[PDB]
């Protein structure tokens, strides 16, 4: 009940000093599904408390790691000391098809590798030379981005000047991005900066070019970074529904596709958090509407498909029903095999800016119950959409600490937890089945009808694995 | 589409015709992709001696580095201390990565915290962060110690850790007695290994510098062991094992083997084992101090020789036969303890394995990279085996170190075709293995893209990766191995020979084609 | 032709055009070879469910067995005894092979002798041989003991070892006190493992039967350990390690770990270590006796329970988690010693590794063969991991053992698709892996031809061999591994997961084809 | 000196009882190159002393392992208990080209696998049924051999009757061989039996079939079992010399080739020990001469080539000199690279029935010196050919024991030993470089000009390997 949660929070909150206790009580709340405005319950997108072991990353992760890095045919420079780039190198499973090293570069790490020289004297000259070296050694690149690491702004380098100048010299799109770790409070501003960089440096390239053949069925997938091929298992359904997916952002994405996106009729936005900014921009300038969708589990995949089809004629609406009918026996078999094995089990989630609400439907479709969810860098308009998704008096936590997440789990005693790599091996030692909800535990995809099968299999394999029954020695009883 | 009795993941899901057809249409429709023949043309080009000449003329661009930041090594160092919380002054994005990086290599939790410095700290400096951080950290996680590192941001704005820590004490954010050693760890200098060195010397100075009057070399009748940046759990354990076996008193300083290998028993242990505070304070009283990785422990050495007045021996990493021998004999000298029969036998078994495997190892050509000490150890051992280390690369090496390696190569006939490369990266290496093809690569998981590339040119050009180094993310539990001592020598020897035989099987597996040579007995 | 700077061996020498052309002309000229089309037709046929039905109706013909003679196991047993010379009564051809077989597996000398019986012995029996043999053997090699086995020849002639040994003593060919235990080891019954059992019981009866009056169970405060036919040195060592760690007094009976791992120091040590004669004589005084491989120690058990009156516990091989647990708990009960924290932690680390690797192991299908105990141990462990053992084959198994394995499969959801085969051979298995394709095979080096065969049909049909068992001839030093206890569990788990990931890399290595899934992080 | 060797022998011989000491003094001798008859110095092909750890095998090894097993298109049954076949399975590197399991069977193990039933009641009925099962499951086999293990003769089975009866039923050559382990004293009789089996059951098959097209240049390689492809590197030279190698016995050999051998003009015998018997037979019946050759090292390969060419017209003799000239710069380079590294070094050999004398020339060509040699099962006509090959007062040992071979080595202190797998790991522990001279240390081939390169490389790699200078710990000095 509500008061059982309200004093759980107070128990956990006792550990903190006076100043810290006040901050965290605002970021911890029971869910109230009848509420309209989430600011009454919880606060979000505020500074992290120093030294509380937040799970959050920086703006560079939001820009380079999330938005830009996935674009295949562009080369993305980690501009600064060797480090940020190394840890982000192929860390994220944003899948793509290409000849890596030749026409695509996603899983490579290009960096300026700052020494003292370059901090003292600035790295504008180094950046210039670096771009020339790329053009020589990587002739098939179709563009370059410059991802600013912390020092760049602090030493006052003008990467905008270099980008413009070298852009006109080589006749290539070179995008400067001010995604320095210290800006903002999380990945979230990194997205916003990255989005704004696309607007300012890329999106307007074909404003005066209507040579591309259009149809009234053209769309773009916006904010699907194709983890384990999620975008592909999404796309296939849209093209089977009789639509034309002109662009994907940015999973398996390309620059030509970004440039073509202002020509589509509808923007289909998976991740609101990361890509609502540019979606709004295209509605303003180019007049393109956009709608949020959700391809997690049959219930939402179906809802979404129909909601999209309804934006077109009755031909799409028909094709939509053929599609749903084609996959009904596939997902029904999945529910037959696995729902029995998962019915009643209880889950606690903690992910970034979307998946804490999106994946709920998928769990509910295997008879599971999400009892705890939280976002790392989510805003109050993310909590607005989580309200009706979560059960009554379930547990909400923004920017949860290591301490808080552990303490909560011990009282709630969930059958399963869904979170990231840093939280993974903690909860596996406590004997609690764990699934990664970023990397998919190196599995996937989990989107669409084809993904739901995999999702179900994966939850079952982990939740009912024989390893969990063996944690305690027979003698220590 | 999915059949439920045999569900497909990304692979081989996307090999279905429906998906293949979709991606063809995506490509042709909207990707404006270069033609396949242009791509093949350029790919062929990147394998040429011409492309290599351009590649090696690079001056600004680094591609596919084989190194990390200082703070990374600082964290790993700090984790070797009892109930110590690694704490890094600067941006929280760094710690997110540090933890992940280690998470993926060790498949263990990794504890570390940040000040969460933001834009405000660029103008006003990070004093307030340090204060609130130190306070919150201590309150929330109950460490007995907090070891402070820096991110580049803090270094550039020029924050003074010493002053900042003291003012936190002065203003009652942390108790005065509470131990908060620190070190400056600029990511724009050296590498992860330099961070380990700076942190470690930061910790050793905190517990000893002021209290050196009562100290007397030899009083504790033990040997200090500084291990350096080590990511193989077998390496901490083998040294401990060999010293116990010798009956030598030792003190392992920065010992994280316990905290990176807690059991799964139903408890989460945030802290576990570690070098004690008293072990550090008593360290000056040791007979002597031995550095396992001398080439990244330059600052530590200056302090130990300088302040503790220990004659630090001139010892190479104890890898392979000769350098394990020399290591054991030094300890015998320092400790007074003879080398026992059990270690003389272990040695004898390694030599037996060398005699048993020499025919397959002889003349095999290798490319290898990693941190300086590791790399030179590997080189040495390969030469003991009769292998040819053709391409030796150390991104975080220097001319002094290079010269030391060139000396070793010159002392062996197997080093005639070797070449050492410092400040170069895996994109440089990629070239080398195309133009001057070895049999194998030895190195970390980042070498899989090179293997991918070499296969693309053709099967007869494929250079297989043997995973020894750090990080290793695409295999499980190799972090449990040993590379040091005779045990580590035996594991490596086995990996090398069986990698040769595995590949030879693969080449001879073609029926009525190459299987004339698919021998049962190798 | 040869270039001197890069000399070629058989492979790839004979891929030169001159040689290829020569062999084409040889084939067409004189070999009268079936047409390639006919060959491909028959090959295709041998992979079908039709061919399998015929294959499994075999009654006389055995093809590619997975077993050996009794005397082999006898030799290995005897080698576990101090300064003991295995000696085999019969034809010298047998010993030549026994030595070679072990030579190739252990890459060590293997000492064994024959009495070199010939045609004359068919008529007159092998009395004179035994006399001169025993004498010569003792004189030449100075054994402290000689353990006598039989070749099939001697068994068929019906020679009486007992009488023959005694007459050698009676006629002064050897001293009366000189110990010459013996056992009948007919190759036409059971397998190598039956030979181990017969020899061991032969040795235990020699030193105890007549001297049982003064014996009292428990006097020793120790546990006897009979290991059975074991070819992993880690298995002898791990048990010793775990018992020491528990503070349990133990007696390892037949312990050859020293003689199959002598150092290379300049001496040839024909003999080294071993169970002492006194250890055997004192064995009856032990608290109890534990058999590590009960399913091939049936005769030993009857003698221990029967003559020594030891309540032999009903324990499975200590492989995997549950059976290592059960083993350790039994010892705790028998010995009075608690299970110490170090082993509770080791256990916890194995479970940690299971949690870390479960996603990749889950649902993997395996075919496996070997000796009964090993095989069922493996099966059990696979089930603990969430793997599916689809094809379980034991050429030298029996209906009672099969029933015991069927019980284990029935108790687990992962045994739903499992099937157990006794008295079948690797040619039977070959069929099974074509018709009901697993992901991997687990077994000895003989499984490489099956892999060869499956590849020939196509890459998507290839079943990779993971080498665990005996013999292993085409890899080096895998005889040093462990399969027993938590240590053995951890080595296997690592081998299995990394075999899955190695193959997944191989499948995803195709550029712009399958490399979408060539992830850095697994 | 002769007397320094004569008392070395007596020192080693001290260990033996009176009866054994007398036997072994006959089987140990210094070499006298001026002697014509080897019976004056040494005795051979006698019974082994019981319990002295001879290196010798049995007649089954000689028959199945050496002669018959190499024939690819035949199926060879190991008839008896399971073991003999299992230990011989792919133990010997007799190389061949085929689809194993379909048209060739060399590396497989077919066996009757006798139980008690079959000892008591005999296995004649089992053998019959077994042959029927082969014909069903292995239709492309071109013939069957039955290799008798010890029990077969002892239980009085009539495999000749079964072979004849099933031979006429299936219309296949089925060859019974009485190679029972207990017959003879060594592999040697196994060869003789195997040879005689070929005569009696195979060789006469085309006596009234002259359809095969012949030339004046047809030959057979006799007694080369193609270890590591030795026969192939031999053959290529003969076909480059303008000869036609109609048959190989039995390395990569076939039944058709054995049947065709009576049509050739000359039999070229590599291994006299194993195959002189059948060579003599073909000289009697078919009138075909035969000569011994030797393709170990340039010196002998050249001598042999010319000696063979001289048996034909001047066309062959010319082609011979072309060949010699072609390979002169190749072997000259080999001697250039390796002789420096091997000059002066001293060798001790111990192999079966041929290679103890044959390989000497190859060593001498790299400036090495064989100081000790011995045969396992060699006869006195093998020692007759070793006399002039070996140096004066070098060490000869027939059927050497484990003790003897070790003790000898300690006094002689050779730089290298060449022997078998059972002796290998002994001498590697003493710190003495070792090469296998049966399996070639899983290398080869070593015959011909192409083999000599490999031979040289292999001796160098082992003799001067860095492992050998490391055996003693620095401290234990
Ligand atoms: S057949 Fe003989 S023992 Fe002449 S049984 Fe033996 S493959 Fe030896 S010295 Mo092994 S008479 Fe061949 C032989 Fe020489 S098996 Fe090989 S190497 S040249
Ligand atoms: S918050 Fe983010 S990850 Fe941090 S630096 Fe800043 S952009 Fe980058 Fe980089 S090199 Fe290392 S990890 Fe840092 S100290 Fe600099
Ligand atoms: S001398 Fe030779 S190998 Fe020996 S048996 Fe005889 S033919 Fe054969 Fe065979 S199965 Fe075992 S290994 Fe022997 S006891 Fe019988
Ligand atoms: Mg782990
Ligand atoms: Mg050995």
Residue numbers in the entry:
A (entry chain C), D (entry chain A): 5 to 481
B (entry chain D), C (entry chain B): 2 to 523
From the paper:
Nitrogenase provides access to bioessential nitrogen via the reduction of highly inert atmospheric dinitrogen (N2) to ammonia (NH3). In all nitrogenase isozymes, H-subunits form a homodimeric reductase component (‘HH’) that transiently associates with and transfers electrons to a catalytic core. This catalytic component is a heterotetramer composed of two D- and two K-subunits (‘DDKK’ or α2β2) and contains the active site metallocluster where N2 is bound and reduced to NH3. Three previously characterized ancestral variants were targeted from phylogenetic nodes within the evolutionary lineage of Azotobacter vinelandii Nif (wild-type, ‘WT’): Anc1A, Anc1B, and Anc2.
Anc1A and Anc1B are the same age, whereas Anc2 is reconstructed from an older phylogenetic node. As an additional distinction, Anc1A and Anc2 contain an ancestral D-subunit protein complexed with WT H- and K-subunit proteins. Specifically, all ancestors crystallized at pH 6.5, which is unusually acidic for nitrogenase. In addition, all ancestral proteins crystallized in space group P 212121, which differs from the space groups for the same proteins in A. vinelandii NifDK (i.e., WT; space group P 21), Clostridium pasteurianum Nif (space group P 21), and Klebsiella pneumoniae NifDK (space group C 2). All three ancestors showed anisotropic diffraction: 2.65–2.93 Å for Anc1A, 1.82–2.8 Å for Anc1B, and 1.82–2.42 Å for Anc2. Global structural differences between the ancestors and WT A. vinelandii DDKK are relatively minor and within the range of variation for available extant structures. Among the two hybrid ancestors, the RMSD between Anc2 and WT (0.24 Å) is smaller than that between Anc1A and WT (0.31 Å). Notably, a non-conserved Nif-D α-helix (positions 165–174 in Anc1B) lies within interacting distance of HH. This helix contains several substitutions across all ancestors, albeit the positioning of polar amino acids differs among Anc1A, Anc1B, and Anc2. Herein, the D-subunit S165A substitution is consistently present across all ancestors and may influence interactions with HH S175 in the ATP-bound complex, potentially reducing stability.
